[PDB]
Design a protein around this ligand. Structure first.
Ligand SMILES: Nc1ncnc2c1ncn2[C@@H]1O[C@H](COP(=O)(O)OP(=O)(O)O)[C@@H](O)[C@H]1O
Ligand SMILES: Nc1ncnc2c1ncn2[C@@H]1O[C@H](COP(=O)(O)OP(=O)(O)O)[C@@H](O)[C@H]1O
Ligand SMILES: [Mg+2]
Ligand SMILES: [Mg+2]
Lengths: 324, 323
């Protein structure tokens, strides 16, 4: 197709012109095996092995026998595994630095409470400012010219995090379906008391994702909590357990609304129980965040794990410098 | 005691001075049999047979053999039953007039929705104005410089009444414990999602009333719903059924908060199912409303029935401005 115009562009200069052409041929057919493999080869020239591996991996799901994809993937597979493991060790060192501290840290922890609430509500459509959120939580008084629903999302958030810290963080034992229901009960409660802490009764659509049918949600969730308490899940790197737990919940989509808020909170319960700080996916990241989740639906869960690992690194930085 | 000073004050003028003295002797001993009976006699001179009869009935619970209380109660008892029955027939006629109507009525019906919400929340401490309540329900936008909890009480009310009208009013069959839980779920939901539609786990105090222990709430409520569906309850005058349902639920006090709001709503479900309009206990009535509830706890549920019957008459009067 337009891939031939891309390859000719790569040969003798025109890198930017070639990259745009590759994107066009993939925009028409994102299942175009030869376009994926050629773009993967092109990505390695920019030192982007991670993307190249995804491109080669994506092609081998379409055509599991493509020779050019195969010979390249067989080289990128263990290499990327090593690149990702090294990043998780960088994260582990920054956690050692953060968990080796106090008054300097306390000031950061209070600043980030309103920051976590602002971004978890703003990522789902909420118009309230950090200043408006601070007014609501400190005063208990309403913000003028702003809907009551948007303000009850904030009261719900505060209550859910207060419940996790008080009841769930320091708690010894297995995580149950009821613990998940108690989080949502608070997240959605002040907004929708009828649906809060209750599963979806209807079939819904999340972007291009069609979650399990309401008849299957109970079996899917019982299987989910089993995985949370399974030995293999506890053997995973905490940053991997947290992203997988988040993804898996957001996929099941057990509730009408508040599935992301609950999932981003369950993720933070996981991290914290492993001695990691709570993390925030900023409202500006919605596009990549949605893209990586979409990529995980398509078969590759890795770009989401990396997105979560990057949010954890950026949270660990910020903490380090405000205490350095 | 000071009753002798009260009795002498009655002899030759000084009515106001004698009445205050009677109140003082009752403020010291509210179980003083001779003070109750003599105030009962005194009340009849003012044409208040209803209160005189309350006084004689109160004395006969303390001393079930007091001759002066007995001879008077035997006379006032069937007389009061006649006075109360006549009032219920006045109410019945005003319901016939109201349910024989339209544009004149429609204007009243809409104004009473916001009016019922304003008084049910204002009676429990809520500072929101009728105009602020109208803003919240019509716009879905918050009222500035007013707490979020006060505004979520209003959202809860609207949802609860919407659920009763849509699901409960025109529904055929028996009322369940779950229907009561569904009303409270909406009344309290937006304020306290944790406790909404869930029974008290702790023992509480309501004024001077100590409701059943949380261990007993389920048995007390199962007995309550049985009475709601019982033949004897359906045989009562609708204004009496509604007054008693409310008293019985508010006595049990099954929830941490929202007991009065659910009770005043359950009472309106009863009235409406009997073709009566919904009624409102105005915020200015909290004092009498509580006095009459305290009095029902003390053994006499009649002054609360009359309180409810008067609220129903005043509601029927506003609607009769249309004819
Ligand atoms: N393709 C997808 N598949 C699964 N989950 C997705 C997809 N795209 C977005 N999501 C998730 O769906 C959630 C949005 O649904 P929602 O229940 O309304 O969450 P919230 O209301 O708490 O903001 C977000 O957590 C997002 O992570
Ligand atoms: N002495 C009493 N005995 C029983 N119930 C009472 C007494 N005094 C008041 N009540 C009832 O208790 C209610 C207050 O309880 P509450 O849970 O706070 O209801 P709400 O918050 O909806 O107003 C009042 O509405 C009244 O109906
Ligand atoms: Mg949403
Ligand atoms: Mg109260």
């Amino acid at each position: 197709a337009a891939l031939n115009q891309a390859l000719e562009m790569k040969r003798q200069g025109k890198r930017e012109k070639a990259q745009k052409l590759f994107m066009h041929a993939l925009k028409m057919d994102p299942d175009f095996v030869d376009a994926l493999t050629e773009f993967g080869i092109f990505s390695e020239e920019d030192k982007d092995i991670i993307q190249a591996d995804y491109l080669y991996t994506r092609a081998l799901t379409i055509s599991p026998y493509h020779e050019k994809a195969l010979v390249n993937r067989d080289r990128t597979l263990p290499l990327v595994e090593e690149i990702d493991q090294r990043y998780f060790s960088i994260i582990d060192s920054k956690v050692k630095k953060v968990m080796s501290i106090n008054s300097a840290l306390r000031r950061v922890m209070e600043e980030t409470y309103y920051h976590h609430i602002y971004h978890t509500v703003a990522i789902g459509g909420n118009t309230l400012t950090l200043s408006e959120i601070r007014h609501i939580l400190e005063t208990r008084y309403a913000v003028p010219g702003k809907s009551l629903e948007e303000q009850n999302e904030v009261i719900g958030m505060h209550a859910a995090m207060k419940y996790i810290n008080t009841t769930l963080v320091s708690r010894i034992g297995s995580v149950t379906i009821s613990d998940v229901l108690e989080i949502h009960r608070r997240v959605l409660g002040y907004v929708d008391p009828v649906e809060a802490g209750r599963f979806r009764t209807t079939q819904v659509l999340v972007g291009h994702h069609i979650p399990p049918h309401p008849q299957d949600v109970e079996k899917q969730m019982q299987e989910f909590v089993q995985w949370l308490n399974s030995e293999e899940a506890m053997n995973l790197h905490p940053v991997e357990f947290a992203a997988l737990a988040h993804y898996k919940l957001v996929y099941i989509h057990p509730f009408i609304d508040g599935n992301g808020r609950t999932s981003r909170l369950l993720m933070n319960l996981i991290l914290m129980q492993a001695g990691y700080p709570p993390i925030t996916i900023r409202k500006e990241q919605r596009s990549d965040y949605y893209h990586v989740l979409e990529a995980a639906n398509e078969g590759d869960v890795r770009p989401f794990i990396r997105f979560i690992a990057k949010c954890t690194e950026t949270t660990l930085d910020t903490l380090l410098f405000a205490t350095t």
